[PDB]
Amino acid sequence: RPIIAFMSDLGTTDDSVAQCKGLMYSICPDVTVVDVCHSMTPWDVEEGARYIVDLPRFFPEGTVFATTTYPATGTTTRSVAVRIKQAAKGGARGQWAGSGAGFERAEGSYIYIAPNNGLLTTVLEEHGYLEAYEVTSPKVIPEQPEPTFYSREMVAIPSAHLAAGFPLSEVGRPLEDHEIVRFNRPAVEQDGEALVGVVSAIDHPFGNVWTNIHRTDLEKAGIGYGARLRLTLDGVLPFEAPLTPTFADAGEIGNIAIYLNSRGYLSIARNAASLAYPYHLKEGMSARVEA
Amino acid sequence: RPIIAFMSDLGTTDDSVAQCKGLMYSICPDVTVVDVCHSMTPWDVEEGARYIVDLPRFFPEGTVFATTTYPATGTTTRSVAVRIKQAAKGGARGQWAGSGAGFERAEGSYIYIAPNNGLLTTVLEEHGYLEAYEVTSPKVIPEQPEPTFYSREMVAIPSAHLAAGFPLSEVGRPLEDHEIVRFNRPAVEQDGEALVGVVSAIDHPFGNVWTNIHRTDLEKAGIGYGARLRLTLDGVLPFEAPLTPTFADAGEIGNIAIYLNSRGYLSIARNAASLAYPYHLKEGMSARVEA
Amino acid sequence: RPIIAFMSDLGTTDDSVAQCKGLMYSICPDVTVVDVCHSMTPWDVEEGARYIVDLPRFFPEGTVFATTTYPATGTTTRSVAVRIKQAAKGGARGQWAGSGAGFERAEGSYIYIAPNNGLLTTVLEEHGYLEAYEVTSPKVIPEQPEPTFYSREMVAIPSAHLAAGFPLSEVGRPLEDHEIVRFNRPAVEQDGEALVGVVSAIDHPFGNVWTNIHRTDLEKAGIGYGARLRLTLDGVLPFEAPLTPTFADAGEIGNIAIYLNSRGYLSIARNAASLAYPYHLKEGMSARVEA
Amino acid sequence: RPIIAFMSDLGTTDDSVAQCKGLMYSICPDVTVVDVCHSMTPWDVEEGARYIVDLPRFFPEGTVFATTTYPATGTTTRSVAVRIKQAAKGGARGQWAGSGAGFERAEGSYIYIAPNNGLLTTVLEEHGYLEAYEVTSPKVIPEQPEPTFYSREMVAIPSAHLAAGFPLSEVGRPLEDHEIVRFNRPAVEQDGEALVGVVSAIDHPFGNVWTNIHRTDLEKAGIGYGARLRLTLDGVLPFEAPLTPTFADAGEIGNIAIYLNSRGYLSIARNAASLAYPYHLKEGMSARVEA
Amino acid sequence: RPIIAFMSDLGTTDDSVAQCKGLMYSICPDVTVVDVCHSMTPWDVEEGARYIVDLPRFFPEGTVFATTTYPATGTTTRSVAVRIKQAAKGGARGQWAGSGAGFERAEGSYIYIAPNNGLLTTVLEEHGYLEAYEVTSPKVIPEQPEPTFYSREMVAIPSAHLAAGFPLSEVGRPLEDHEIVRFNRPAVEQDGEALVGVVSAIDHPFGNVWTNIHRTDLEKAGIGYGARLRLTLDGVLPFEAPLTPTFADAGEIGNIAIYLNSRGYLSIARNAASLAYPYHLKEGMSARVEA
Amino acid sequence: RPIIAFMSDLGTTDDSVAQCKGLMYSICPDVTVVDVCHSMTPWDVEEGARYIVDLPRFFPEGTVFATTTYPATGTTTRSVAVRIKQAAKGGARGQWAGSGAGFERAEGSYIYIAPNNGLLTTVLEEHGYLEAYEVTSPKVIPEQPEPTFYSREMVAIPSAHLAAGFPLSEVGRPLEDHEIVRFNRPAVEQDGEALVGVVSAIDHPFGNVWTNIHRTDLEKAGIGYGARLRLTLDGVLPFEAPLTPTFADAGEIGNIAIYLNSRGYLSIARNAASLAYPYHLKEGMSARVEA
Ligand SMILES: Nc1ncnc2c1ncn2[C@H]1C[C@H](O)[C@@H](CO)O1
Ligand SMILES: Nc1ncnc2c1ncn2[C@H]1C[C@H](O)[C@@H](CO)O1
Ligand SMILES: Nc1ncnc2c1ncn2[C@H]1C[C@H](O)[C@@H](CO)O1
Ligand SMILES: Nc1ncnc2c1ncn2[C@H]1C[C@H](O)[C@@H](CO)O1
Ligand SMILES: Nc1ncnc2c1ncn2[C@H]1C[C@H](O)[C@@H](CO)O1
Ligand SMILES: Nc1ncnc2c1ncn2[C@H]1C[C@H](O)[C@@H](CO)O1
Ligand code: MET
Ligand code: MET
Ligand code: MET
Ligand code: MET
Ligand SMILES: [Cl-]
Ligand SMILES: [Cl-]
């Protein structure tokens, strides 16, 4: 039972995704293709990264992540295929996913295949890796790749060979670390007792607000649950709430909750109401926090 | 081949759903996860109800409906898991789904697992139930549920245990009826020969308009096909048309059809054109019909 | 493990699709359903055709394409079921899809099932057909089809019987060619050295612009890679770029690329930026190319 | 203290209008300039005509109407200057305007000055004219008119000379009737008892709906106050109300009133609420009335 | 030199206003018509009131305010004409308007003429009045008023007779106080040290935010300039700033200023930036303040 | 008959402007107040400059230009009052405004009064100045200026004193040149034969596009009428057209005209259609022209 978990920016409006899916079933008859999502902001590798980094602990070992936004499509660049190290505990407290105590996932048990454009930055940082390869072998990519559709040609297709048991180290030469392109994570700065970060995303469809201010960033300025926090978005909209586990802790429908999202990050929202949408709060706006 | 049919408000923009799907495949290797939809109006239990109520007759016996919007996530609340009684004929005339005479579905053959927040109201109304359970066992929910992601923790995960043959009655104690939270259906009033109801939905992507005025509500005011109806949306926009089986019965492209939707309810549309969109007609307006 | 590739206009907002999916699994237990996409512009047969015509080469032989937009739902019209001839090479160069030299696909290896409203126009013209049939048998459609939901009753349901091995020629009587409804493809005109066509689509979610000016139309005005082209949308926005394989060939981010899309068509876009969205360029504007 | 009543499409966003105003005061020191409005849809002569045709009765005799939208600016075309015949009674009943029995206005008492593009169509047809002239004299237009600003140069400037007592017949040679450009008024058709017309305008800022169905058109289908009318916009929105003098006659706030607007035309609206705005009703939709 | 100051909801899109203006110059040849504004929210008497209440001290004595929104147009209701008592000091500090020490304005020196619908509520409250009259005399209103245009017929027209020296007390019988319709001012409540009020308007075109929390409301909870204030709009967006005279006091471009607007009311804004528009802050949203 | 020509960003939605106008009539009974416009982009000094610079040649000698956006309101800053030198020919060829040969305007005949924030930059550039003064005297500004309404207090009021014959040099001390705040004009660069500039404005309500590429900038690259120009907005949308006097020169409705606007600058539009609006072209984009 092989599984390819598919993430791209191909959208949900035409047959793009299906074409990849057609190819995946054609290469690996028994595959289950799990859509991650296909609707990220085109070419936004940083956004992409957020969608792919938290996956491994949820999927059965041997799962293959075909993760792609490919602005460099049709160029000589080639995909990188890495087998990640730890599945890594994640979440508001840092645990294994699943029922009971969660499902402990053995190391070396997932492979990502992605453009070598930085998409895998956070994956590599949070999970580490055992081995990394340039996807150049004509046994796993087309001999005449479609100039514009490298998401299909240099990702989908070879994700399928990988799902189908094609040995990882045969896709092309090993890549040294400096050859795996990285992007720079926007850093969280401890100026004063405060923590400056950014709204790193809007949590659709609810309009919850997500900052890049991680738990660890918080537990080092003191801040843990119960703590009365002042959170300031866009530099002008301040907000006050205690840090709480969840939304209903805010009290009435509409009230502000400051909480840690399911990825471990300081977030803000309204209890059973959208905070972002009425106020057009958006990704890229700054975000300060202090108790 | 166990099937989990998945309905949520998780959206289609991040890895939320896939996280759930990963866990599903991990708990129940053989599962086929069928998306119902994941783009309901967040926290709108009434809306969600409408997407899950008519499913059972279309799915193979033994299907599990993982259905969730969970405003109460992170609280002490626990999901309910019911096995429904009748699959229940549905539709504009009330029939079994499928080719020929349709496929009759044995009683007691589907289980719903949902927040105990009322999402299951109309399900229980239309289908009745054999047994209902508080989803509390550590064998089918996390010991450390992610505060904010109870859709994953108290729904996805346990739906997978259930698909996997985990005995329903072992998820937690039996729930008495009064403990199964219900919402109140907004009622249709026979004031005069008229029927006041409500636009209960816009039928996306077509812009057809659906009222909570069910057939039985109509065949007790007399009205059946052929009948010349006056329908009045928002209290201001009147409409005249015979009740007809379908859209093309309206005649020319753009003409008004008053008809009965595939769920059995009084609806209005334009023949091969959108009624709702040019006029900004919404889920929530007043609907009124007369002869 | 046969496969139904499903394309419709039913949207991703309600349980419509899943109802069809439910029936599919019910009729053909072992089916894998592949979503093509379900968010075509309602009733736009020409658009739908675009989404279905290039699929055969991608899917394993025996794949069944349930392709539907059905404004004539509820009428006496009956769907057509064709087995296509050639899987037909496609793309910017005209190749088999897949790794290596691609996967050659035997003829007579795919069935399309659709409303007889013209959706399969391009299919039939680019792939040809071996045999065509009116879908009338009670063995594959309901005895009381839901008047408004012929996508489900006259497509999904029977697509499932055909996936399940139901002999194609037993769905209903053979249709003669003139009975397969055709729409008229907007033609490309060689007025001068120029080539007048149309923006056939906006390529979502990137905002690339696609014309109905096919490569063949190009290679007979001389035009091939390297050529400096003037492309003029809407009649007033001219555009100058050499015809190149891909986006990055435009140079800096934002630069215009004139290139052939993955379907073989002349297209225009910006390198890692949206061309269509900032300027509200929309399908249907004139499009012209010349040396 | 003579008066130039000024109507144009120059907008209220730049100094365009004021430039004309500046010239007006410069040419006719004692002028009072009355803004009619300057935010007509650019180049829409039919709309402009609506704004200028009913003014004469309101202004003191000798008033000069500088009325302009000039797409032909910078060309050899020259404005027409007419002295109108009748000030012409107007309104829902047909009366002189003002207190008491209103202010009867002598004939031959107002001059219009406009592009010879058809703007004065309705003017000439409802008021008649005594004398018409091509505005060609260097005594009233520039010797080097600004190519793009013929509203200023071929209207405002000369309107000022005429306000200042410049003899009308010395602006340029007389024009014969056939040389005064006319546009064709969309006609109201008595098909049955019904009356087919058009939504001629949206009455901003209220959202009332105005048809080109004049009272006279009404009083010959029988229709006068008290009559129960069916009015049908866009072909599908029917509407039922008695024809009444005013809005409050509809009863409660929000209720539909069918009434005659202040220009004599059949109109529809909501009592102290907008009819057109919530439903995006727009000028140009069909409009029909009957008993 | 008589002046009529004109305020209505007639908009700036057609000849409505001009028709009134035509009539005004016709009744009172020497009048100067000063537009106040014509773009208030139709029928919003409370909004209207805010536009008319602060005027008297700016205009030369004898000025006449023609102030109208007239939902009751065409009914038997009649306008009220009042001569107000004091011109009343206004502003952030409460002073006479003008150069030097300002222009002291004698009592009994302004008349308002308005629908008797409550438009004059705040005028009457802030300025008091000497005498009040029903405008019924056929010497100052038409004998056949246009049903729909009472703004013109029962306001403009008789504002002009009043400007023209027609004795106030001749317009119709005196009205006792209980006959002058009043609306209820939304009250500011001292719950705790805090002051609950409302955003009473958005200050266009800047997007400054205006509350109904008057200076006096502030100087009674202590609050005066310098004071560190917490201001909470919509119940969720808190804000902190010192109360300062003006915008630049906020410091950097973009910073929040809490200040008293030119009408005396607690306001909030961004220094040289819009506060309302990016966040879609709107009239009707609550507004708390506390130091 | 003294004229105050008024330009501000006060908008047209409240009584702001009228407050100013009231004071104007109160200080200078005989004044005619001419609105320039009041809807400029708040605080956008560059924009405002463009609305006030070309006025003088259109107004009678002695006219006073009250021109204001005042971000610094409430601060110690004080307005500047200058008497300009030349009225300065303007336009697409450079002429006096008016009928015949136009009306020559004597030097030293207009005064501008404005915030000393740079609003007057291009005025002083194009017109030069004879004398400049700090507006400080209590005789022409309030002793207690309203902190927030310096447009009224330090502009409207004193413009009225000036219209009223109050000696310019008595408003406050003479200002040396370096004390008259200037902004920097964004410059046009002759890189190659090309001219890079900027869309300096959208010409509302037509959607014509105005560049800061002045005629003289063009007649030194050679370019005069007849010349075939390539113009490139936003760096992406190219355009080809002869330089022509006017719009109709483009030929058919909708065709592109490249021409020189009434202020002398290079502009682009569609003949009797909007260029800017369908394409969302904005004040601020890059403009580039070549041959
Ligand atoms: N106009 C474009 N500029 C830059 N990159 C683009 C463009 N269009 C598509 N892409 C990329 C992203 C897809 O994942 C990928 C599919 O191979 O193609
Ligand atoms: N702002 C919110 N307030 C209250 N509850 C919220 C909020 N956002 C998401 N949720 C809930 C509902 C999801 O279905 C559910 C999935 O765990 O999470
Ligand atoms: N308003 C309408 N007029 C005509 N046809 C409509 C309408 N809405 C849906 N449809 C059709 C097309 C879907 O594919 C189809 C699903 O069976 O339903
Ligand atoms: N793009 C354009 N095409 C054709 N005509 C236009 C355009 N813009 C303005 N106008 C005209 C009409 C104004 O009344 C007039 C003012 O003289 O300028
Ligand atoms: N549809 C309407 N419902 C209620 N009131 C309306 C409507 N249209 C106009 N008005 C009012 C307000 C104007 O000031 C006034 C002009 O006399 O007419
Ligand atoms: N938010 C603001 N920040 C800074 N200044 C502002 C603001 N709003 C108005 N103004 C100024 C500019 C007006 O022209 C001027 C009229 O007094 O008031
Ligand atoms: C708490 S909402 C559950 C889905 C959400 N997007 C998340 O990952 O946390
Ligand atoms: C153009 S890159 C992404 C694939 C594209 N939507 C296609 O159909 O080719
Ligand atoms: C309809 S009430 C306001 C006047 C309206 N705009 C008219 O033209 O009559
Ligand atoms: C401070 S902005 C000046 C105009 C504003 N609308 C007011 O009355 O205060
Ligand atoms: Cl991040
Ligand atoms: Cl108020």
Give which of C122, C124, C42 is closest to C81, Cα–Cα: C124
CA nearest to E230 within chain A: A238
Contact D137/D170 with Cβ under 8 angstroms? yes
Cβ pair A280:E278 closer than 8 A: yes
What CATH number matches the domain at C1-185, 3.40.50.1820, 3.40.50.10470, 3.40.50.10790, 3.90.700.10?
3.40.50.10790
Residues lining ligand 1, Cβ inside 6 A: A 8-10, 42-43, 68-71, 73, 148-151; C 206, 208, 247, 269-272
Helices assigned H by DSSP within chain D: 16-27, 45-52, 121-127, 150-151, 157-163, 215-218
CA C168 to chain centre: 22
Using alpha carbons, list the distances in angstroms from residue D246 to C194, D264, D282, E11.
Answer: 60, 12, 22, 19
In angstroms, what separates the C-alpha of E142 from chain F's closest C-alpha?
28
HSE-up of residue B211 (Cα within 13 Å, Cβ side): 28
φ/ψ of F159, rounded to 5, equals -60, -35
Q: Look up residue F24 and give its DSSP letter.
A: H
CA nearest to E137 within chain D: D100
Cβ neighbour number for residue E284 with a 10 Å cutoff: 10
Q: Look up residue C60 and give its DSSP letter.
A: P
φ/ψ of C212, rounded to 5, equals -80, 15
Instruction: Characterise E77 by phi-psi region: left (phi > 0), alpha (psi -120 to 50), beta (else).
Output: beta
Is B106 annotated as ligand-binding? no
Cβ neighbour number for residue A92 with a 10 Å cutoff: 24
In angstroms, what separates the C-alpha of D281 from chain F's closest C-alpha?
21
Contact D50/D185 with Cβ under 8 angstroms? no
Would you call C30 an interface residue with chain B, using a CB distance cutoff of 8 Å? yes
**b/e code C159-185 from CB counts within 10 Å (16+ = b):** bbbbbbebebeebbeebeeeebbeeee
| Contacts of E187 by beta carbon, 8 Å cutoff, 6+ apart | none
Helices assigned H by DSSP within chain C: 16-27, 45-52, 121-127, 150-151, 157-163, 215-218
HSE-up of residue B71 (Cα within 13 Å, Cβ side): 22
CA angle F184, F186, F189 (to 5 degrees): 135
Query: Which residues sit with Cβ closer than 5 angstroms to ligand 12, an ion?
Result: E 200, 212
User: Ligand 11 center to residue B14 CA distance, Å?
Assistant: 14
Q: Quote the strand ranges of chain B, DSSP E.
A: 3-8, 32-37, 64-68, 80-84, 110-114, 129-134, 195-203, 208-214, 228-233, 237-244, 256-260, 265-270, 286-290
Measured distance CA(C64)–CA(C4) in Å, rounded: 5
User: Ligand 8 center to residue C205 CA distance, Å?
Assistant: 9
CA nearest to A92 within chain B: B146
Cβ pair B237:D279 closer than 8 A: yes
CA angle F185, F191, F197 (to 5 degrees): 35
Which subunits sit against C, judged by 3+ Cβ pairs under 8 A? Answer: A, B, F
Q: Quote the strand ranges of A54-207, DSSP E.
A: 64-68, 79-84, 111-114, 129-135, 195-203
Query: Which SS3 state, helix, strand or coil, does residue B88 take?
Result: coil
Contact C105/C113 with Cβ under 8 angstroms? no
Contact D154/D78 with Cβ under 8 angstroms? yes
Measured distance CA(D33)–CA(D64) in Å, rounded: 10
φ/ψ of B150, rounded to 5, equals -60, -25
For domain D186-291, is the CATH number 2.40.30.90?
A: yes
In angstroms, what separates the C-alpha of E73 from chain D's closest C-alpha?
7
H or E element that contains E214: strand E208-214
Q: Look up residue E245 and give its DSSP letter.
A: S
Is B261 annotated as ligand-binding? no
Cβ neighbour number for residue B172 with a 10 Å cutoff: 19
Cβ pair B236:D270 closer than 8 A: yes
Q: Is the dihedral angle over the CA atoms F151, F154, F156, F159 positive or is it negative? A: negative
Give which of D87, D132, D127 is closest to D107, Cα–Cα: D87
User: A205: cis peptide before it, omega within 30°?
Assistant: yes
User: Ligand 4 center to residue F38 CA distance, Å?
Assistant: 22
Which residue type, as a one-letter code, is found at position D223?
I
Measured distance CA(C96)–CA(C100) in Å, rounded: 10
Measured distance CA(A25)–CA(F236) in Å, rounded: 41
Which residue type, as a one-letter code, is found at position E38?
H
**b/e code D132-143 from CB counts within 10 Å (16+ = b):** bbbbebeebbbe
The DSSP secondary structure of E40-105, one letter per residue, reads S-TT-HHHHHHHHTT-GGGSPTT-EEEEE--TTTTSS--EEEEEES----BTTTTB--SSBT----
Residue B116 tokens, joined: 């105990």
Contact E210/E258 with Cβ under 8 angstroms? no
Q: What is the largest CA-CA distance in chain B?
A: 61
Cβ pair E237:A235 closer than 8 A: no
Cβ neighbour number for residue D107 with a 10 Å cutoff: 15
Measured distance CA(E5)–CA(F26) in Å, rounded: 13
Measured distance CA(E196)–CA(E180) in Å, rounded: 29
Using alpha carbons, list the distances in angstroms from residue C22 to A156, C18, C33, C138, D282.
Answer: 27, 6, 10, 19, 43
Cβ neighbour number for residue A197 with a 10 Å cutoff: 20
In angstroms, what separates the C-alpha of E230 from chain A's closest C-alpha?
10
Q: Quote the strand ranges of chain D, DSSP E.
A: 3-8, 32-37, 64-68, 80-84, 110-114, 129-134, 195-203, 208-214, 228-231, 240-244, 256-260, 265-270, 286-290
Query: Which SS3 state, helix, strand or coil, does residue F208 take?
Result: strand
Which residue in this structure is represented by tokens 């739908």? C48
Residue F243 tokens, joined: 């330089």
| Contacts of B45 by beta carbon, 8 Å cutoff, 6+ apart | B69, B117, B118, B119, B121, B183
Measured distance CA(F231)–CA(F241) in Å, rounded: 8
Measured distance CA(A130)–CA(A127) in Å, rounded: 10
Which subunits sit against F, judged by 3+ Cβ pairs under 8 A? Answer: C, D, E
In which order are the strands placed within the sheet that holds E64-68?
A: E32-37, E3-8, E64-68, E111-114, E79-84, E129-135
Measured distance CA(E98)–CA(F2) in Å, rounded: 19
Pick the residue whose CA is nearest to atom 2 on ligand 2.
Answer: A272
Which residue in this structure is represented by tokens 């002569």? D45
Would you call F50 an interface residue with chain D, using a CB distance cutoff of 8 Å? yes
Residue B128 tokens, joined: 């009745």
Strand duo D256-260 + D110-114: pairing: unpaired
Which chain A residues contact residue B11 at CB under 8 A? 204-205
Which chain E residues contact residue F144 at CB under 8 A? 93, 95, 101-102
Query: Which SS3 state, helix, strand or coil, does residue D20 take?
Result: helix
CA nearest to E272 within chain F: F71
Residue C203, strand partner residues = C208
Measured distance CA(D23)–CA(D152) in Å, rounded: 8
Residue D43 tokens, joined: 């180049």
Which residues of F line the annotated binding site for S-adenosyl-L-methionine? Answer: 9, 14-16, 70, 151, 203, 208, 262-263, 270-272
Contact C232/C199 with Cβ under 8 angstroms? no
Measured distance CA(D127)–CA(E290) in Å, rounded: 65
The DSSP secondary structure of C126-170, one letter per residue, reads HH-EEEEEE---TTTSBSS--TT-HHIIIIIHHHHHHHTT--GGG
Which chain F residues contact residue E31 at CB under 8 A? none
Residue F285 tokens, joined: 């984009």
Measured distance CA(D260)–CA(D224) in Å, rounded: 10
Residue A181 tokens, joined: 């392109």
Give which of C26, C15, C8 is closest to B36, Cα–Cα: C15
Which chain E residues contact residue A240 at CB under 8 A? 238
Would you call F170 an interface residue with chain E, using a CB distance cutoff of 8 Å? no
Which residue in this structure is represented by tokens 């140079």? C251
Query: Which SS3 state, helix, strand or coil, does residue B59 take?
Result: coil
Contact C156/C20 with Cβ under 8 angstroms? yes
Give which of D8, D30, D23 is closest to D141, Cα–Cα: D23
Strand duo A64-68 + A3-8: pairing: parallel
Using alpha carbons, list the distances in angstroms from residue F124 to C66, F84, F110, F118.
Answer: 72, 7, 12, 10
Would you call E256 an interface residue with chain A, using a CB distance cutoff of 8 Å? yes
Using alpha carbons, list the distances in angstroms from residue E200 to E11, E37, E68, E211, E285.
Answer: 21, 18, 20, 5, 8
Give which of E243, E239, E215 is closest to E228, Cα–Cα: E243
φ/ψ of B8, rounded to 5, equals -160, 180
φ/ψ of C143, rounded to 5, equals -80, -30
Measured distance CA(D259)–CA(D268) in Å, rounded: 6
HSE-up of residue F84 (Cα within 13 Å, Cβ side): 30
Strand duo A265-270 + A286-290: pairing: unpaired
Residues in chain A: 291
Contact A43/A69 with Cβ under 8 angstroms? yes
Helices assigned H by DSSP within chain E: 16-27, 45-52, 121-127, 150-151, 157-163, 215-218
Is E117 annotated as ligand-binding? no
Q: Quote the strand ranges of F110-236, DSSP E.
A: 110-114, 129-134, 195-203, 208-214, 228-233
Contact B255/B270 with Cβ under 8 angstroms? yes
Give which of D96, D106, D6 is closest to D51, Cα–Cα: D6
Which chain C residues contact residue A18 at CB under 8 A? 5, 34-37, 55, 58
Helices assigned H by DSSP within chain B: 16-27, 45-52, 121-127, 150-151, 157-163, 215-218
Cβ pair A240:E235 closer than 8 A: no
Measured distance CA(D114)–CA(D129) in Å, rounded: 14
Residue E95, strand partner residues = E90
Measured distance CA(E186)–CA(E45) in Å, rounded: 13
Residue A76 tokens, joined: 């000589």
In chain A, where are the structural domains located?
A: 1-185, 186-291
H or E element that contains F45: helix F45-52
Measured distance CA(C59)–CA(F54) in Å, rounded: 68
Residue C287, strand partner residues = C197
H or E element that contains A126: helix A121-127
Q: Which of C236, C240, C280 sits opposite F280 (nearest CB)?
A: C280
H or E element that contains A286: strand A286-290
Measured distance CA(A69)–CA(C149) in Å, rounded: 37
In terms of C-beta density within 10 A (0-12 exposed, 13-18 middle, 19 or more buried), how is residue E227 classed?
A: middle
